[PDB]
Design a protein around this ligand. Structure first.
Ligand SMILES: CC(=O)N[C@@H]1[C@@H](O)[C@H](O)[C@@H](CO)O[C@H]1O
Ligand SMILES: *[C@@H]1O[C@H](CO)[C@@H](O)[C@H](O)[C@H]1NC(C)=O
Ligand SMILES: *[C@@H]1O[C@H](CO)[C@@H](O)[C@H](O)[C@H]1NC(C)=O
Ligand SMILES: *[C@@H]1O[C@H](CO)[C@@H](O)[C@H](O)[C@H]1NC(C)=O
Ligand SMILES: *[C@@H]1O[C@H](CO)[C@@H](O)[C@H](O)[C@H]1NC(C)=O
Ligand SMILES: O=C(O)[C@H]1CNCC(O)(O)[C@H]1O
Ligand SMILES: OC1[C@H](O)COC[C@H]1O
Ligand SMILES: [Cl-]
Ligand SMILES: [Cl-]
Ligand SMILES: [Cl-]
Lengths: 383, 74
């Protein structure tokens, strides 16, 4: 189905400019299906790109290949994990002899660990583990072609991610202990996303749950397929308008910190809760505050009580609900009753908290998600 | 019922995520759109990208292994 394509120095410059001026760090995936006479990686094209990027002064991290597991199916070429390790070794040598000798390298961007992908990842790590700074794998829950609205609301669907994560860590810890593990490319459903589902309020249960579990289970970095593009799992649509998941993401950026804690409900599935220290770059909040976030997949409102010593603290609510009339299939979302929309093309809106009565229960309507910030919580681990 | 009690473990961090924990991708296949330059040039899009800073942007996808650099291309 897929054929070779070339791309220009212009394209490189657009991509880097976009990253650079947006305050983002760029990871460029190089073509791994350029081979030699003995099925060895032919590095000459990358060398061209490597050289060009050094000359222009671009600070770029690298990957080599994407889903090598599907190479046989998609290009009639099989590369085993050993070989691919060797190929990563060869690329590493090229980076260390470049202007950015410390340039970061990540791989191998294998699919989620079924039996075939586990063997490939293991042998890849035994051979190439030495030179990768992070292990990248990808995850999707469902086939976008067949995925239902019920699937997106279903806790048993959410739960499968957990075993995927355990299987990656079981391979990594058996071959390169303590290597950082990243989700390299991930979202709701594959094949471009589920139509009328992956671009809606309903998509947010899978997105926020993925984040909470990933943080809790030790994933360091999660990369969301896709910021912008043809697939309806995009955060931003073809008109450059943001979808519910963008607003969910932005809320998460601002409120949720790097130190991961744990929260759980007495009598444990449809009420799912996560706890981190509050993001200390948030100017409203202070060292020691907590950020709780919670998903409610029941069909009624639920009411959460905070434990001692946090019962009578000031809580700030940040609750997300679709702007009707399309309900969970809406492409619009409100924060505490206020619709979220760009002020102008240059200006994101404020995200106004709703302060709750100290000592009050935490309301979480049916099919919703919310953040809650617990102010002056004075949690020593957060300082 | 509907009133649920929460337990919180707060004695130490159980893990530390990157400041870039929530990052984003651009599919490599986007570079085969004639309008790539306009798309990523959009100031409106850049504004939206700025909001998720700090973050990695991973440029990759199936098409990764079907793209060849050409330093002469128009
Ligand atoms: C009032 C009522 O019976 N409605 C349904 C019920 O049939 C279902 O068993 C329950 C738990 O999922 O959720 C309710 O929405
Ligand atoms: C792409 O080009 C490479 C050149 O090294 C070639 O080996 C490969 O088969 C090409 N893929 C096709 C024809 O789709
Ligand atoms: C690698 O590919 C280049 C460009 O197509 C080709 O000219 C060269 O002979 C190849 N080198 C090896 C080592 O096979
Ligand atoms: C490139 O960026 C990283 C941060 O993303 C920075 O720490 C690094 O030093 C930069 N590259 C160099 C070493 O010039
Ligand atoms: C992997 O493939 C290479 C050739 O590309 C071959 O020499 C090697 O035996 C294979 N690895 C294993 C361990 O089967
Ligand atoms: O939507 C999908 O099915 C993805 C699979 N991984 C690679 C990709 O991001 O290019 C997509 O094709
Ligand atoms: O509404 C009830 C409650 O939310 C517990 O889950 C089952 C439902 O019937
Ligand atoms: Cl996958
Ligand atoms: Cl293999
Ligand atoms: Cl795309």
């Amino acid at each position: 189905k897929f054929k070779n394509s070339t791309y220009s120095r212009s394209s490189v410059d657009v991509l880097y400019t976009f990253a650079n001026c947006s305050g983002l760090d760029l990871i460029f995936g190089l073509n791994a299906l350029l081979r030699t006479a003995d099925l060895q990686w032919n590095s000459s094209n990358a060398q061209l790109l490597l050289d060009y990027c050094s000359s222009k002064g671009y600070n770029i991290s690298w990957e080599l290949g994407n889903e090598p597991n599907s190479f046989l199916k998609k290009a009639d070429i099989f590369i085993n994990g050993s070989q691919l390790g060797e190929d990563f070794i060869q690329l590493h040598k090229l980076l260390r002899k470049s202007t950015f000798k410390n340039a970061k390298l990540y791989g191998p961007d294998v699919g989620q660990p079924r039996r075939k992908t586990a063997k490939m990842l293991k042998s890849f790590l035994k051979a190439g583990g030495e030179v990768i700074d992070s292990v990248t794998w990808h995850h999707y829950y469902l086939n976008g072609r067949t995925a239902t609205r019920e699937d997106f609301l279903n806790p048993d669907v959410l739960d499968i991610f957990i075993s995927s994560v355990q299987k990656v860590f079981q391979v990594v810890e058996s071959t390169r202990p303590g290597k950082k593990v990243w989700l390299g490319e991930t979202s709701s459903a594959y094949g471009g996303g589920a139509p009328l589902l992956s671009d809606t309020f309903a998509a947010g249960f899978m997105w926020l749950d993925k984040l909470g579990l990933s943080a809790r289970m030790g994933i360091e970095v999660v990369m969301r397929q896709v910021f912008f593009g043809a697939g309806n799992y995009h955060l931003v649509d073809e008109n450059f308008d943001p979808l519910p998941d963008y607003w969910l993401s932005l809320l998460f950026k601002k409120l949720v910190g790097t130190k991961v804690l744990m929260a759980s409900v007495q009598g444990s599935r449809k009420l799912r809760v996560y706890l981190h220290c509050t993001n200390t770059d948030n100017p409203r909040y202070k060292e020691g505050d907590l950020t709780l976030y919670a998903i409610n997949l029941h069909n009624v409102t639920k009411y959460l009580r905070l434990p001692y010593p946090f019962s009578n603290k000031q809580v700030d609510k940040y609750l997300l609900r679709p702007l009707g009339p399309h309900g969970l299939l809406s492409k619009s979302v409100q924060l505490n009753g206020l619709t979220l929309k760009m002020v102008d093309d240059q200006t994101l809106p404020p995200l106004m908290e709703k302060p709750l009565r100290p000592g009050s229960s935490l309301g979480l309507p049916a099919f919703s998600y919310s953040f809650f910030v617990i102010r002056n919580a004075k949690v020593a681990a957060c300082i | 019922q509907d009133v649920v009690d929460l337990d919180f473990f707060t004695q130490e961090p159980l893990h530390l995520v990157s400041p870039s924990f929530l990052s984003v991708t651009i599919d490599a296949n986007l570079a085969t759109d004639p309008r790539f330059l306009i798309l990523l040039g959009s100031p409106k899009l850049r504004t939206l990208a700025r909001g998720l800073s700090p973050a990695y942007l991973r440029f990759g996808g199936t098409k990764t292994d079907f793209l060849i650099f050409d330093p002469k291309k128009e």
